[PDB]
């Protein structure tokens, strides 16, 4: 019933919760539109959405309470072969979750599951967009350079301006992805677009070969569900090198078009893929 979580199955053991489903590069379609080294690689934002969705369904609270994911680590990428289904599983005990995948033919052998992401979930009962006066980032040149990594469903930044290591971007879903607001807590395409604003700032100064990949996130909090359009403020932490870096860290704040805070991301940790 969630496009990535699948369905909740009976608790495998007392106090242990579990969701399982099947995905492929064709469904959700955006899972087939991100590549690294010519392999289809599931975007890390997929795991953040699964965790937010699990928080909403497992943890108590008013519907309007904020959804929280903390201490996220991405352990192993999920590589899809075009059109071949993969079993996905999110398991939870207490506040901690794990996301694994398996070949459907081997999904009953517990040792056939590869761990992709882990963290903690929480729920809590319920800053402004700066006037940056930035320099416009030319997005067409960015998209054309990044098209070896990203397909046309994942080019959702409309405007981006920078000043120092900060930027404000306007991201808006379109096409099928804008029609799916009822399906996700925060559409992976929208959050990926916000993270790509960080990429656009980085790649002004260093190469997009061996591209940066999200490996961790200290905290993400979501205050409104089903958002299709935001302005995002991002701040890159001071880099270790002015030439070429293996890692970056960024904080982000997402606002609706009225300036109300929709989501906040603390210490997104990026590392170049080997």
CA distance 271 to 274: 9
CB of 31 or CB of 43, closer to Mg ion: 43
Listed in sequence order, the residues at least 6 apart from 116 whose beta carbon sits closer than 8 Å to its beta carbon are 42, 47, 74, 75, 76, 77, 78, 99, 100, 101
CA distance 169 to 28: 25
Question: Does 154 engage in binding with Mg ion (CB under 5 A)?
Answer: no
Rounded least distance, CB 213 to Mg ion, Å: 5
Catalytic residue check, 233: no
CB 259 within 8 A of CB 130: no
Choose the catalytic residue: 2, 100, 192, 248. 192
CB 137 within 8 A of CB 167: yes
Which residue's Cβ has the minimum distance to Mg ion? 44
**What mask of x and - would describe binding to Mg ion in positions 187 to 216, judged by CB under 5 A?**
--------------------------x---
User: The tokens 């990594």 sit on which residue?
Assistant: 149
Question: Closest Cα partner for 266 from 253, 255, 251?
Answer: 251
CB atoms within 10 A of CB 118: 18
Judged by CB under 5 A, the stretch of 41-49, 117-125, 171-179, 234-242 that binds Mg ion is 41-49
Catalytic residue check, 248: no
Judged by CB under 5 A, the stretch of 17-25, 42-50, 104-112, 152-160 that binds Mg ion is 42-50
Residue selected from 44, 119, 169, 188 as contacting Mg ion according to rule CB under 5 A: 44
Question: Does 121 engage in binding with Mg ion (CB under 5 A)?
Answer: no
Question: Does 4 engage in binding with Mg ion (CB under 5 A)?
Answer: no
Instruction: Return the half-sphere exposure (C-beta side, CA atoms, 13 A cut-off) of residue 2.
Output: 28
Residue selected from 4, 40, 43, 99 as contacting Mg ion according to rule CB under 5 A: 43
CB of 55 or CB of 213, closer to Mg ion: 213
CB of 44 or CB of 169, closer to Mg ion: 44
- SS3 at position 58: helix
Question: Does 168 engage in binding with Mg ion (CB under 5 A)?
Answer: no
Question: Does 173 engage in binding with Mg ion (CB under 5 A)?
Answer: no
Structure tokens at 136: 């416009």
CB atoms within 10 A of CB 7: 10
CB of 18 or CB of 217, closer to Mg ion: 217
- SS3 at position 248: strand
Rounded least distance, CB 116 to Mg ion, Å: 11
CB of 18 or CB of 215, closer to Mg ion: 215
Active site residues: 34, 192
Query: Which residues sit at the interface with Mg ion, rule CB under 5 A?
Result: 43-44, 213
């Amino acid at each position: 019933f969630h496009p990535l979580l699948g369905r909740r199955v009976p608790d495998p053991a007392p106090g242990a919760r579990c969701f399982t489903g099947t995905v492929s590069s064709d469904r959700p379609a955006y899972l087939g539109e991100h590549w690294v080294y010519d392999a289809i690689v599931v975007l890390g934002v997929t795991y953040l959405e699964m965790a937010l969705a699990a928080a909403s369904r497992l943890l108590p609270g008013n519907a309007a309470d904020t959804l929280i994911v903390e201490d996220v680590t991405v352990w192993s990428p999920l590589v899809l072969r075009a059109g071949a289904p993969a079993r996905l599983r999110l398991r939870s005990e207490d506040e901690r979750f794990e996301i694994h995948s398996a070949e459907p033919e081997r999904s009953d052998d517990e040792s056939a599951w590869t761990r992709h992401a882990t963290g903690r979930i929480a729920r809590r009962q319920l800053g402004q967009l700066p006037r940056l006066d930035g320099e416009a980032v030319e997005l067409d040149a960015y998209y054309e350079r990044m098209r070896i990594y990203y397909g046309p469903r994942l080019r959702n930044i409309r405007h981006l301006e920078r000043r120092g290591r900060e930027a404000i971007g306007h991201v808006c879903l379109q096409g099928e992805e804008a029609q799916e607001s009822a399906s996700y807590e925060l559409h992976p395409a929208l959050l990926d677009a916000c993270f790509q604003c960080v990429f656009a700032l980085i790649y002004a100064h260093e190469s997009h070969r061996e591209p940066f990949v999200p490996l961790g996130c200290a905290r993400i909090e979501l205050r409104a569900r089903g958002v299709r359009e935001v302005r995002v403020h991002l701040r890159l932490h001071p880099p270790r090198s002015t030439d070429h870096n293996q890692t970056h860290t960024a904080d982000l704040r997402l606002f609706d078009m009225e300036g109300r805070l929709v989501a906040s991301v603390d210490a997104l940790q990026l590392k170049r893929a080997s």
